[PDB]
Amino acid sequence: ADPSAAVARAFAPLLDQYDVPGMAVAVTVDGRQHFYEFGVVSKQTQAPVTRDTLFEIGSVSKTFTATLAGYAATRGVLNLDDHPGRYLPALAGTPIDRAELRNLGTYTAGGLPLQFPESVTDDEQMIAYFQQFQPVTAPGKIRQYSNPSVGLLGHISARALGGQFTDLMQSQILTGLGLRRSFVDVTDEAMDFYAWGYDKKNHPVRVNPGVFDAEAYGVKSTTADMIRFIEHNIDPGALEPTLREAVKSTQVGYYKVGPMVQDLGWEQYPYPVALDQLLAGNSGEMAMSPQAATAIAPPSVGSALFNKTGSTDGFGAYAAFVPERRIGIVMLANKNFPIPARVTAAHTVLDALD
Ligand SMILES: [Cl-]
Ligand SMILES: [Cl-]
């Protein structure tokens, strides 16, 4: 039940192998938290990574956006079967308005691309982009991983709840979950803890501003906070009912897509799971290309694993947990290094428990 030896074998070699300046890992095993840090937050300062170092989690942010959408749905300010035009009047009657909010959250809205075109740089251009978008397939049939897609779901969740996404996410979700060192906008105080990321040429970088950045990939967090978030997902029973249902809402499977099941936010697998099936579900093809999606009833009994990868130009992250086993792991790193290496390391550690 002690993950330390497995973490040292699985994670420590990664820094030299992928030229990663710094990395933080936390494992939870039946409520006991284990923290491991490697390397440095900055090549210039050489200050050590700690469990309180802020890293960009990239698309792991979509699990928080799903939680916000689940909070909105539990409150009844929105329904996942609604269409965008009920909340954004300028989108009523447009082709994307055939999609339901559930399709936006599962990347099945009709072929929204990975990223906005470079010409979309503000809210006006965002509205016009969605008005003009011509879907390449019917909703619910094709999964195409998409930042604009989950971005729009977060924008609509904020509009429904009657506030700014950043303020709602910070106050109702992050603070509500006890994540007091997690931010969409890092405060002046917490800035001292924010690592630098290191791009392909080893230049220090942080995530650039973009449309729907906060909504799709903009959270900064620490392993101390992210392991608490994972523990909420493992057992949300201690949460106040609104947040409890918001968390549970991210664990409902909606589509079978080959070896993986698509939730809002999380992606799920049976457990135990062969690493090969986890690698297949987390492949580059899965993230880059259209995949046939089959609507299913939610799987619900026995053991399941939930995960989400995330990256920015300078950072890489991975989170995975198994509620029935009360085990979970998060890795945050200040280099975007290959997802298969992240998944393999994390799977090896979880497999070594029991
Ligand atoms: Cl984008
Ligand atoms: Cl920031």
The ligand with the least distance to the CA atom of 184 is 2
Which of 59, 157, 221, 311 is flagged as catalytic?
Answer: 59
d(CA 221, CA 177): 13
Q: DSSP for 168-213?
A: HIIIIIIITTT-TT-BSS--TTGGGGBPPEE-TT--EE-PPP-TTH
**Quick check: 345 and 331 in contact, CB under 8 A?**
yes
Query: Within 10 Å of residue 199's Cβ, how many Cβ atoms?
Result: 14
Distance of CA 237 to the CA centre of its chain: 22
Please state the φ and ψ torsions of residue 320, each to the nearest 5 degrees.
-150, 145
Q: Residues near 17 by Cβ (< 8 Å), separated by ≥ 6?
A: 341
Distance 115 CA to ligand 1 centre (A): 4
Please confirm whether the linkage preceding 204 is cis (ω < 30° from 0). Answer: no
Distance 185 CA to ligand 2 centre (A): 4
Strands 267-270 and 260-262: antiparallel
Is 59 catalytic? The answer is yes
What 3-state class would DSSP assign to 28? strand
In which element (H, E) is residue 322 found? Answer: strand 316-322
Q: Residues near 15 by Cβ (< 8 Å), separated by ≥ 6?
A: 21, 22, 23, 38, 39
Tell which residue, 208, 267, 199, has the closest CA to residue 43: 199
d(CA 328, CA 179): 17
Which of 36, 71, 87, 145 is flagged as catalytic?
Answer: 145
> Computed from CA positions of residues 271, 65, 129, 87, in that sequence, does the dihedral angle turn out positive or negative?
positive
The ligand with the least distance to the CA atom of 194 is 2
User: The tokens 């509620």 sit on which residue?
Assistant: 323
Q: Any idea where the domains of the chain sit in the sequence?
A: 1-354
The ligand with the least distance to the CA atom of 145 is 1
Is 254 catalytic? The answer is no
d(CA 181, CA 65): 17
Distance 210 CA to ligand 1 centre (A): 7
> Computed from CA positions of residues 233, 62, 227, 354, in that sequence, does the dihedral angle turn out positive or negative?
positive
Radius of gyration of the chain (CA): 19
b/e 277-288 (16+ beta carbons within 10 angstroms → b): bbeebbbeebbe
Distance 127 CA to ligand 1 centre (A): 14
d(CA 166, CA 182): 12
**Quick check: 158 and 69 in contact, CB under 8 A?**
no
Q: Residues near 260 by Cβ (< 8 Å), separated by ≥ 6?
A: 267, 268, 269, 280, 281, 282, 286
The Cα angle at residue 288 between residues 351 and 150, in degrees rounded to 5: 85
Distance 353 CA to ligand 1 centre (A): 37
The ligand with the least distance to the CA atom of 151 is 1
Torsion of CA 219, 225, 227, 231, to 10 degrees: -100
Tokens (6 digits) for 307:
């995960």
1-354: which CATH topology?
Beta-lactamase (3.40.710)
Distance 192 CA to ligand 2 centre (A): 12
d(CA 116, CA 119): 8
**Quick check: 224 and 49 in contact, CB under 8 A?**
no
d(CA 350, CA 259): 19
Distance 207 CA to ligand 1 centre (A): 12
Tell which residue, 316, 117, 310, has the closest CA to residue 205: 316
